[PDB]
Design an enzyme around this catalytic site. Structure first.
Site, mmCIF file in Angstrom:
data_model
loop_
_atom_site.group_PDB
_atom_site.id
_atom_site.type_symbol
_atom_site.label_atom_id
_atom_site.label_comp_id
_atom_site.label_asym_id
_atom_site.label_seq_id
_atom_site.Cartn_x
_atom_site.Cartn_y
_atom_site.Cartn_z
ATOM 1 N N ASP A 59 28.979 51.204 52.027
ATOM 2 C CA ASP A 59 27.944 51.374 51.025
ATOM 3 C C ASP A 59 26.629 50.813 51.548
ATOM 4 O O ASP A 59 26.184 49.748 51.128
ATOM 5 C CB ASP A 59 28.343 50.675 49.735
ATOM 6 C CG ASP A 59 27.433 51.041 48.579
ATOM 7 O OD1 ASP A 59 26.382 51.666 48.830
ATOM 8 O OD2 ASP A 59 27.767 50.690 47.426
ATOM 9 N N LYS A 113 23.628 52.562 51.538
ATOM 10 C CA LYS A 113 22.471 53.184 50.909
ATOM 11 C C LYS A 113 21.345 53.515 51.882
ATOM 12 O O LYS A 113 20.202 53.155 51.651
ATOM 13 C CB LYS A 113 21.941 52.256 49.830
ATOM 14 C CG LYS A 113 22.933 52.074 48.740
ATOM 15 C CD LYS A 113 22.424 51.165 47.714
ATOM 16 C CE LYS A 113 23.451 51.090 46.615
ATOM 17 N NZ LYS A 113 24.759 50.694 47.200
ATOM 18 N N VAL A 114 21.679 54.204 52.961
ATOM 19 C CA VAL A 114 20.698 54.547 53.970
ATOM 20 C C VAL A 114 19.496 55.169 53.284
ATOM 21 O O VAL A 114 19.624 56.145 52.531
ATOM 22 C CB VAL A 114 21.307 55.505 54.979
ATOM 23 C CG1 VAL A 114 20.370 55.715 56.144
ATOM 24 C CG2 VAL A 114 22.624 54.936 55.452
ATOM 25 N N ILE A 126 13.707 56.739 57.520
ATOM 26 C CA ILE A 126 13.255 58.032 58.027
ATOM 27 C C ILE A 126 14.419 58.649 58.793
ATOM 28 O O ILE A 126 15.364 57.957 59.172
ATOM 29 C CB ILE A 126 12.036 57.904 58.988
ATOM 30 C CG1 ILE A 126 12.428 57.112 60.228
ATOM 31 C CG2 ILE A 126 10.883 57.236 58.286
ATOM 32 C CD1 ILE A 126 11.318 56.942 61.200
ATOM 33 N N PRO A 127 14.364 59.964 59.037
ATOM 34 C CA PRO A 127 15.433 60.648 59.761
ATOM 35 C C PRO A 127 15.904 59.975 61.048
ATOM 36 O O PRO A 127 17.093 59.751 61.231
ATOM 37 C CB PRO A 127 14.844 62.034 59.998
ATOM 38 C CG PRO A 127 14.038 62.258 58.759
ATOM 39 C CD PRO A 127 13.335 60.921 58.594
ATOM 40 N N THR A 156 15.737 56.887 62.151
ATOM 41 C CA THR A 156 16.455 55.640 61.920
ATOM 42 C C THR A 156 17.776 55.840 61.178
ATOM 43 O O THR A 156 18.757 55.176 61.482
ATOM 44 C CB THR A 156 15.564 54.644 61.171
ATOM 45 O OG1 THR A 156 14.385 54.412 61.949
ATOM 46 C CG2 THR A 156 16.283 53.319 60.957
ATOM 47 N N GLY A 191 33.169 47.941 34.241
ATOM 48 C CA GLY A 191 33.577 46.554 34.260
ATOM 49 C C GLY A 191 32.354 45.699 34.035
ATOM 50 O O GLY A 191 31.655 45.851 33.038
ATOM 51 N N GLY A 251 38.115 54.780 31.363
ATOM 52 C CA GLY A 251 38.487 56.068 30.805
ATOM 53 C C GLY A 251 37.394 57.104 30.680
ATOM 54 O O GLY A 251 37.537 58.227 31.169
ATOM 55 N N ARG A 253 33.379 43.194 40.837
ATOM 56 C CA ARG A 253 33.614 41.907 40.188
ATOM 57 C C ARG A 253 34.803 41.807 39.209
ATOM 58 O O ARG A 253 35.528 40.815 39.245
ATOM 59 C CB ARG A 253 32.314 41.447 39.523
ATOM 60 C CG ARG A 253 31.287 40.980 40.537
ATOM 61 C CD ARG A 253 29.908 40.961 39.952
ATOM 62 N NE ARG A 253 29.393 42.302 39.719
ATOM 63 C CZ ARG A 253 28.333 42.555 38.961
ATOM 64 N NH1 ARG A 253 27.693 41.547 38.374
ATOM 65 N NH2 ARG A 253 27.919 43.806 38.786
HETATM 66 O O1 LIG Z 1 8.066 54.496 55.641
HETATM 67 C C1 LIG Z 1 8.670 54.041 56.584
HETATM 68 C C2 LIG Z 1 9.686 52.941 56.355
HETATM 69 C C3 LIG Z 1 9.825 52.008 57.586
HETATM 70 C C4 LIG Z 1 8.964 50.783 57.370
HETATM 71 O O2 LIG Z 1 7.900 50.648 57.955
HETATM 72 O O3 LIG Z 1 9.377 49.814 56.526
HETATM 73 N N1 LIG Z 1 9.515 52.678 58.886
HETATM 74 C C5 LIG Z 1 10.021 52.014 60.135
HETATM 75 O O4 LIG Z 1 8.995 51.981 61.194
HETATM 76 C C6 LIG Z 1 9.670 52.185 62.486
HETATM 77 C C7 LIG Z 1 9.165 53.460 63.172
HETATM 78 O O5 LIG Z 1 7.939 53.196 63.857
HETATM 79 P P1 LIG Z 1 7.759 54.334 64.990
HETATM 80 O O6 LIG Z 1 8.877 54.254 65.963
HETATM 81 O O7 LIG Z 1 7.752 55.791 64.302
HETATM 82 O O8 LIG Z 1 6.360 54.098 65.765
HETATM 83 C C8 LIG Z 1 11.177 52.289 62.188
HETATM 84 O O9 LIG Z 1 11.809 51.010 62.358
HETATM 85 C C9 LIG Z 1 11.207 52.778 60.748
HETATM 86 O O10 LIG Z 1 12.465 52.494 60.133
HETATM 87 C C10 LIG Z 1 8.774 53.848 58.936
HETATM 88 O O11 LIG Z 1 8.391 54.294 60.007
HETATM 89 N N2 LIG Z 1 8.440 54.527 57.819
HETATM 90 O O1 LIG Z 2 24.203 52.511 41.272
HETATM 91 C C1 LIG Z 2 24.766 51.670 41.931
HETATM 92 C C2 LIG Z 2 24.666 51.714 43.439
HETATM 93 C C3 LIG Z 2 25.926 51.117 44.118
HETATM 94 C C4 LIG Z 2 26.847 52.236 44.483
HETATM 95 O O2 LIG Z 2 27.850 52.452 43.835
HETATM 96 O O3 LIG Z 2 26.563 53.011 45.548
HETATM 97 N N1 LIG Z 2 26.628 50.076 43.301
HETATM 98 C C5 LIG Z 2 27.561 49.149 44.030
HETATM 99 O O4 LIG Z 2 28.817 48.954 43.300
HETATM 100 C C6 LIG Z 2 29.238 47.549 43.473
HETATM 101 C C7 LIG Z 2 29.289 46.818 42.127
HETATM 102 O O5 LIG Z 2 30.514 47.077 41.483
HETATM 103 P P1 LIG Z 2 30.770 45.907 40.412
HETATM 104 O O6 LIG Z 2 30.897 44.607 41.082
HETATM 105 O O7 LIG Z 2 29.580 45.870 39.348
HETATM 106 O O8 LIG Z 2 32.126 46.230 39.642
HETATM 107 C C8 LIG Z 2 28.214 46.898 44.400
HETATM 108 O O9 LIG Z 2 28.683 46.932 45.741
HETATM 109 C C9 LIG Z 2 26.969 47.740 44.171
HETATM 110 O O10 LIG Z 2 26.048 47.605 45.234
HETATM 111 C C10 LIG Z 2 26.417 49.972 41.940
HETATM 112 O O11 LIG Z 2 27.091 49.221 41.266
HETATM 113 N N2 LIG Z 2 25.465 50.691 41.312
#
Ligand SMILES: O=C1C[C@H](C(=O)O)N([C@@H]2O[C@H](COP(=O)(O)O)[C@@H](O)[C@H]2O)C(=O)N1
Ligand SMILES: O=C1C[C@H](C(=O)O)N([C@@H]2O[C@H](COP(=O)(O)O)[C@@H](O)[C@H]2O)C(=O)N1
Lengths: 216, 220
Positions: B65, B67-68, B71-72, B74, B178, B185, B198
């Site tokens: 989990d 949550k990537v 940018i593409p 990375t 939970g 259900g 939890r």
């Molecule tokens: O909007 C965003 C989010 C994130 C950030 O800055 O937090 N980055 C980060 O900036 C770097 C690319 O710079 P370069 O390699 O293209 O020169 C990477 O580490 C990206 O994950 C972005 O580029 N755009």
């Molecule tokens: O919308 C979302 C995104 C994310 C997910 O499911 O991707 N989670 C994840 O589900 C778990 C909590 O379940 P519990 O401990 O509350 O029972 C954590 O690992 C959260 O980060 C959410 O709870 N809500």
């Protein structure tokens, strides 16, 4: 305060390759941004190390984007690992950003709010919420933001929202297409990734970028 | 039948932050679930190797989990690293757009793993910006070939809407039952499986915690 207004985005996935290009430009930088590519493939200890093998400051670009409870645990571990600041996404809402803020304050560290992203797909949803997010950032009391250099116009609006005494940094310079000159007009510093760490000589890139803006 | 099924329709969200408690607690509930969701809380405290370890010791599938949401370019490295760690699947945000999601899908396709698209989140804050884009992220995921989704149990009316968008042939998992208030259900009226954290790992007796959820669902 970031040396030369430049921040290294060490996005190489090889530990050595990393501490290398990082040493091949140590001269022009004192602030390093480290992401998941490096950390996941080498471990969180690659941070507490940097804070010595180079003495520099580390911004953990983790784009925290989970629920409040989980954001809190992620920020704790990133700070325990010794990170100076962590970059947090704003689209998940104010309670999620608030969670990261508490932990930063509890541990005396920094939260950076990413308002808008630099890449193309960013048009679909991120862009339309950008301003409202920056504003949420202000209500929340966020003092640090991240904005896109790939969009000079948005970058200027962002500065208008956040204020003059708010810290701002900008990615997308170089590979993505942003210019180090135009960008530094509204933001406190730029972030260059591939444009350095992938050049035949990274040392002779973080030198030219400093030249193209050593005027200001 | 194309997508792997989850034993008892129950996915454990293992978010304890120390290797021993995570292992101890997961072992106790092993006979009840065969899919484990490992996120950053554990992986950043104990390292990515924890992923192969769980997978081997418990024989369960592992969903990273993460949550990537980058940018593409990375996102591609995050997915390659996660799959190299052995995860069977990885959860990706949709808000960053179609290009960011497609980058994850390419690596998954290349390595023979799966992508789950998070459309709407379960916390309150989710109403501010993700809810408004949720239906479109879902529809975007469908057009991109995404077959696995994550929707919120804390809002059955929204989980229902999302099920209609994604259709009956795609896999939907739902968190928030939970600790967050969702009912096992109701959620399962639309989700194929529920994610529970939890309510099980912070319980005095985890196994009983898990057996009791599995029980109230046995009938339904
Ligand atoms: O909007 C965003 C989010 C994130 C950030 O800055 O937090 N980055 C980060 O900036 C770097 C690319 O710079 P370069 O390699 O293209 O020169 C990477 O580490 C990206 O994950 C972005 O580029 N755009
Ligand atoms: O919308 C979302 C995104 C994310 C997910 O499911 O991707 N989670 C994840 O589900 C778990 C909590 O379940 P519990 O401990 O509350 O029972 C954590 O690992 C959260 O980060 C959410 O709870 N809500």
């Amino acid at each position: 305060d970031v040396m030369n207004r430049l921040i290294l985005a060490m996005d190489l996935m090889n530990r050595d390759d990393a501490l290398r290009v990082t040493g091949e430009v140590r001269e022009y930088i004192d602030t390093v941004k480290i992401g998941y590519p490096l950390v996941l493939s080498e471990g969180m200890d690659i941070i507490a190390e940097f804070r010595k093998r180079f003495g520099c400051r580390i911004i953990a670009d983790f784009k925290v984007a989970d629920i409040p409870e989980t954001n809190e645990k992620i920020c704790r571990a990133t700070f325990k690992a010794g990170a100076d600041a962590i970059i947090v996404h704003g689209f998940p809402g104010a309670d999620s950003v608030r969670a990261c803020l508490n932990v930063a304050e509890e541990m005396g560290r920094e939260v950076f709010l990413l308002t808008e992203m630099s890449h193309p797909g960013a048009e679909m949803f991120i862009q339309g919420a950008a301003d409202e997010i920056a504003r949420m950032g202000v209500d929340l009391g966020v003092k640090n933001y991240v904005g896109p250099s790939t969009r000079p116009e948005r970058l200027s609006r962002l500065r208008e929202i956040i204020g003059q005494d708010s810290f701002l940094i900008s990615p997308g310079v170089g590979a993505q297409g942003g210019d180090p000159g135009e960008t530094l007009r509204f933001a406190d510093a730029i972030i260059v990734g591939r444009s350095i760490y992938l050049a035949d000589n990274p040392a002779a890139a973080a030198a030219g970028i400093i030249e193209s803006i050593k005027d200001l």
